[PDB]
């Protein structure tokens, strides 16, 4: 199947309290595997997946240097952006950076992306052609010109098509036993009477990986039962995910309702009744 190597960088300025807080995390598919947090005297990039301890000290030293330098660059960018918008020093502001490379089912480079946001809104985008930028306003147009002056699109294209692709291949091989292992959901249905005439049927999906999943309550010919309550897919805390879907049914008709669960770890979709 398809796979992705993704990083998320966040820098938040702390007025009157020193350098901005900087936190970055790396993901392979739906699995976090590294983290960097500058809230320390000697901040380090550290593993967040057990299979990354196969990486030696040189890897960790290099990633620590890269992340420390990114934080300093982001402190500069926050100051630059504060001047672009003529904003006071008394206000807290946020700069975010996300980038990633995605492989197709053939294992070849399919798409790369890179984007910046300021105070929770799109700021500057590296287009999927990997050769041009798009600015959201006049401030970001100056940032676009800087990127043009430095051939930044060419530099980021090289990272996304070469460095990113190569290391995604390495990570997938080192963590194959978990990254390439589809974990099917464990499913069951719970029943909670609301009154003498109504009841809640809750269809559970527990302990699955990856996070992509579909839950539907079927009521005879209606595949998506009216007023089905879906919760956002949520992490269990152990690397797997959870989700449930609930419906209120007339008491005594629970047998007319069927829950469908579709997940890539299931050879066929599963149906359940209370």
């Amino acid at each position: 199947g398809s796979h992705s190597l993704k990083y998320f960088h966040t820098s938040v300025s702390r007025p009157g309290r020193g350098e901005p807080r900087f936190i970055s995390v790396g993901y392979v598919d739906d699995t976090q595997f590294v983290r960097f947090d500058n809230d320390a005297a000697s901040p380090r990039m550290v593993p967040r997946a057990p299979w990354m301890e196969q990486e030696g000290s040189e890897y960790w030293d290099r990633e620590t240097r890269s992340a420390r330098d990114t934080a300093q660059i982001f402190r500069v960018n926050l100051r630059t952006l504060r001047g672009y918008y003529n904003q006071s020093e008394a206000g807290s502001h946020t700069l975010q950076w996300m980038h990633g490379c995605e492989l197709g089912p053939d294992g070849r480079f399919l798409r790369g992306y890179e984007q910046f946001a300021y105070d929770g809104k799109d700021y500057l985008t590296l287009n999927e052609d990997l050769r041009s930028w798009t600015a959201v306003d006049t401030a970001a147009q100056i940032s676009e010109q800087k990127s043009n002056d430095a051939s930044e699109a060419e530099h980021q294209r090289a990272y996304l098509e070469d460095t990113c692709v190569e290391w995604l291949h390495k990570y997938l091989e080192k963590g194959k036993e978990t990254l390439l292992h589809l974990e099917p959901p464990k499913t069951h249905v719970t029943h909670h009477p609301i009154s003498d005439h109504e009841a809640t049927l809750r269809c559970w999906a527990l302990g699955f990986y990856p996070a992509e999943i579909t839950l539907t309550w079927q009521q005879d010919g209606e595949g998506h039962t009216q007023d089905t309550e879906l919760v956002e897919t949520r992490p269990a805390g152990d690397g797997t995910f959870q989700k449930w879907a609930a419906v209120v049914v007339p008491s005594g008709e629970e047998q007319r309702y069927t829950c469908h669960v579709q997940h890539e770890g299931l050879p066929e979709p599963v149906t359940l009744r209370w």
């Binding site: 960088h9 890269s66 960018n77 940032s143």
Partner: peptide
């Protein structure tokens, strides 16, 4: 791994 040099804005 992540980029060595992050873009300037």
């Amino acid at each position: 791994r992540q980029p060595a040099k992050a873009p300037l804005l």
